[PDB]
Design a protein around this ligand. Structure first.
Ligand SMILES: Cc1oc(-c2ccccc2)cc1C(=O)O
Length: 273
């Protein structure tokens, strides 16, 4: 069934999320990514409107599934004896933001603005769907190179969005907020804003600002690259130590640095050719 409907291509990557393969849906040659997740490694299990025992990732992907291209689309899923197999859409050609930054270095601000804006729309979409990604980072962002569109992937560390405190975290530590580091306590939106500040810094500087807990806790931001004041202001704002001092998604998107964003197609034409 999974074996007959899909032609398995090469391994795209593996890690904490499991193993993701390039693939093609045999019926219409649709490019897909086949993600295998070991059951023993699934800590968060959820229930669909049917009531089946599935990993939370599947619940979250279904909650965020729509025509909106800013988030990876779950096309299908299969349960195997010891794993879950997720069929995800696969943009072609594609490059993750991490590989993009590794190759190109620090992004021009116009490019970072377009990318960052698309990440914001994608995160806002997650949140409107009741999903907290919890692992917003360059590696979890795919660039559809032809369309200039970004896709948020890997909902495997995610949770249902709630207004109460989260005391569990399995996303990326260097993207985690100081309140998580110090107290093991964070609120969804403000931790997402912190990780967005790390991401924005990473986009415009070519690397994350903090490598150690103490740097996270201190929250002193040093710009190793020439970054505009408006951009440094937005970064410093997302990276406020006090969760309540962080901007809301609205304030980030109304920030002066975020004005006159390029359309994804314009972004592709100028920067991804
Ligand atoms: C790790 C991962 O990689 C992908 C993917 C990679 C290249 C093209 C399309 C999708 C999705 C996920 C996921 O976890 O959702």
């Amino acid at each position: 069934p999974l074996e007959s409907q899909y032609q398995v291509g090469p391994l795209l990557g593996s890690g904490g999320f499991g193993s993701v393969y390039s693939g093609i849906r045999v019926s219409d040659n649709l490019p897909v990514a086949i993600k295998h997740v070991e059951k023993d490694r699934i800590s968060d299990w959820g229930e669909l409107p049917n009531g089946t025992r599935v990993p939370m990732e599947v619940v979250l992907l279904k909650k965020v599934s729509s025509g909106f291209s800013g988030v990876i689309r779950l096309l299908d899923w299969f349960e195997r004896p010891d794993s879950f197999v997720l069929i995800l859409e696969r943009p072609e050609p594609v490059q993750d933001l991490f590989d993009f930054i590794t190759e190109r270095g620090a992004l021009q601000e116009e490019l970072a603005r377009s990318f960052f804006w698309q990440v914001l729309e994608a995160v806002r979409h997650c949140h409107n769907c009741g999903v907290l990604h919890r692992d917003i980072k360059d590696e979890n962002i795919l660039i559809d190179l032809n369309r200039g569109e970004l896709k948020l992937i890997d909902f495997g560390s995610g949770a249902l969005l709630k207004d109460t405190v989260y005391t569990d975290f399995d996303g990326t530590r260097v993207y985690s907020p100081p309140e998580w580091i110090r107290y093991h306590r964070y609120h969804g939106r403000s931790a997402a804003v912190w990780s967005l500040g790390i991401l924005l810094y990473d986009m415009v500087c070519g690397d994350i600002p903090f490598e150690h807990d103490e740097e996270i806790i201190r929250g002193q931001v040093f710009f190793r690259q020439r970054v505009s004041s408006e951009c440094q202001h937005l970064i410093r704002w997302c990276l406020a130590l006090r969760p309540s001092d962080r901007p809301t998604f609205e304030e980030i998107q109304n920030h002066p640095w975020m004005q006159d964003v390029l359309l994804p197609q314009e972004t592709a034409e100028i920067h991804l050719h």
